[PDB]
Symmetry: C3
């Protein structure tokens, strides 16, 4: 295991591949092209701590993907990793894992086609053995599938953001990945509209640069806890969730939740009102994880 | 961290502030005054183990607070801690955390006003940085907000109690709080009506003095797992939950659950029937935690 | 603790009791006889790793029990353990734990009667102090109670299997049981119909011999995470759950879930469609546990 890690260290030594933009375009009323990369990219996960992350597109978690319910995805993965194969598993899709979530070799590309027939906030991740290693090293993200008939509370929502929770462990350390507590637990935000922040899973960015909102607004968060290993007790300080849709399916409706339990890979659409000006921490209420980085901020102003 | 803990030890050495009763009174059809303390109080959490707890009112978890849906709370915190600032975060309320959940200095008081517009079983806790430290040291509790229109099963309920789950760690040890397994996991009960028990989070009291009920009764428990860190798999041995309302919101109705998953800070209203005389253990079904203290007893008699 | 374990080692040394079939028969429209054993049986939980398991009937998890909603169970436990008392707790039943879930001494039998009035997928386990020790050593299983009025989606289901998740720790090590990470986390399958596999909780069997299905089929899994200690993030790779019934109660209906959060002892009925030929991994998405064994396979063929 650690001999392989020593070999990995030599092969990825000095490798820092600049982020490559996600490419997407609609090619039919129910067909969409998506082109992503697997690449090796240095990310500062805490001040003074660089993690040479295994990523989609040089982000960890990876870039946001948004499609409509009923879209068939024509997906291409370009593997830029000089030595490790990589793959893609979208939780949104119906696919044959052994035919459609297969490995793409270093310096090669693979193309796969599958439908997204279910609305919600789905995890995506690399599906290459050991899957734990590929996820823990940074190969995770979110795909949102917009419901054909929306959510019953759509008209009430004033502003929206995407938040993702993930853990970071000791660098490419399989023993730690399997047996150790996370070194950091973090939130990131991925842009839905021009001007939205787009950040990586780190301990600081969403504290230094809070998400922004106005007094009185109803805020929707599309959220997913990608793990790899921990569950999340999602809570926004100073408010209560008016409405919650588990995994973002409109049918899984809950009301007036203080805290939303998310399994590893679990998602939700949560909506809440901010009644007063100020800064509202966003946490996992498992406070050991909050202490290890998992606190984002929402700054609410009159204007 | 441990130099600060050594300084903390010196400052709280010999400090054992006797419990001070919660003070509450209604001042209008939708307005209620609540007066609490932050204080340092020795609690026996296991036989032979004294924890010099950071508390509200000399109890850990703190005293029960009950209000009605739609009540505005006029809250005062009197900080009796000679050296550490403290604050209050009620999960029931809509408030500006940076204006309304702010620190109160040693030997000072602070007053804050906010509405409780949502029914349920909410965690409250100290919101002072590091929040993990303040919660782990004992600054947690429950506020119940009674629904305007009750619960659909109100008429079926024969008896009710409040139960709270919490963990205890190595004394004021931030490394342990962040990285270690809990030393003890415990239940406590807080009084709803005269004659109800009112206990602290310890490994023994609810075993030695079980909650009481009669054969055939439908029992309601208002429950919250305050953590700080663990989730709870709440189960009453020998019965099944007839009805469950997640976070105590009447809309989040489940039926016939064997076990209720609670996130850290998660609450519920659970209802079950005890059909035969005997003693019924109440557990988290995460049995490592049950073994470390988290078993309460319900003694059911013909009379 | 470890002196008792040393004494236990001597007493169970060389003991390997061959599996004994479950015995069940219906004795009335709403009355069923069930006869089980407690016995000590060597199980290979990972290649080269024998665990001298404490079991019901020489299986760990124990044999599947299926009854109808409203059945009263006349249950007999025959304790074959030469030295340790054992008992039975069925989560399906209403019973007095202190009268009905009581210990049966070595080489004795006990008979208990109680109703199963609630539909669902319930854990059963030994209830002998320390309960953690008896569960961790292998005394867990599932009882299914079939709903009187079925599930609304019954007509859509093409094939069904039972899956159970459990952990294994260091052998009969109470310190590890309470404080340590699981050494292995595993799935097993228990037969519902002739020809179904029936396996023990190990890291390999459901990989080497996948569950079988046909292209296009809707599959139902009756699932329970028996722990003892961990929660489960249940996910089938390459599909989405069309319908989920929490604890197998028809009322607790969710739709379009990617992943189902199960507490320790938590169950569910989950249904999903497999659209393409291939092999579909079944995991807990807490990937440290998946890496430590918790991956089963579903092989889907045209025929
Ligand atoms: Cu990969
Ligand atoms: Cu909180
Ligand atoms: Cu405090
Ligand atoms: Cu149990
Ligand atoms: Cu036993
Ligand atoms: Cu996955
Ligand atoms: Na953990
Ligand atoms: Na900066
Ligand atoms: Na733990
Ligand atoms: Na006493
Ligand atoms: Na664990
Ligand atoms: Na074999
Ligand atoms: Zn196309
Ligand atoms: Zn195409
Ligand atoms: Zn608005
Ligand atoms: Zn007033
Ligand atoms: Zn006032
Ligand atoms: Zn009654
Ligand atoms: Zn009979
Ligand atoms: Zn009989
Ligand atoms: Zn079909």
């Amino acid at each position: 295991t650690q001999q392989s890690a020593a070999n990995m260290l030599a092969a990825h030594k000095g490798v820092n591949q600049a982020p490559v933009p996600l490419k997407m375009e609609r090619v039919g009323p129910h067909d969409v092209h998506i082109e992503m990369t697997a690449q090796i990219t240095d990310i500062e996960i805490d001040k003074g701590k660089i993690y040479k992350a295994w990523t989609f597109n040089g982000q960890a978690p990876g870039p946001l993907v948004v499609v409509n319910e009923g879209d068939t995805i024509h997906f291409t993965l370009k593997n830029m990793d000089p030595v490790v194969p990589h793959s893609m598993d979208f939780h949104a899709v119906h696919a044959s894992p052994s035919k459609d979530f297969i490995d793409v070799m270093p310096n090669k590309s693979g193309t796969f086609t599958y439908p997204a027939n279910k609305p919600g906030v789905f995890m995506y991740h690399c599906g290459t053995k050991p899957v734990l290693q590929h996820i823990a090293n940074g190969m995770h993200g979110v795909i949102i599938v917009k419901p054909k008939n929306g959510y019953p509370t759509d008209k009430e929502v004033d502003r929206e953001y995407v938040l993702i929770q993930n853990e970071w462990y000791k660098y490419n350390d399989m023993n730690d990945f399997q047996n150790g507590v996370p070194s950091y637990v973090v939130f990131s935000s991925k842009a839905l509209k021009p001007g939205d922040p787009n950040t990586n899973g780190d301990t600081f960015t969403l504290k230094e640069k809070p998400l922004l909102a106005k007094v009185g607004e109803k805020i929707r968060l599309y959220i997913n806890n990608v793990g790899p290993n921990e569950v999340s007790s999602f809570h926004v300080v100073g408010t209560v969730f008016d409405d919650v849709y588990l995994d973002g399916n409109p049918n899984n409706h809950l009301q007036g939740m203080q805290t939303v339990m998310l399994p590893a890979s679990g998602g939700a659409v949560v909506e809440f009102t901010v009644t007063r000006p100020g800064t509202y921490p966003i946490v996992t209420h498992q406070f050991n994880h909050a202490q290890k980085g998992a606190v984002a901020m929402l700054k609410v102003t009159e204007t």
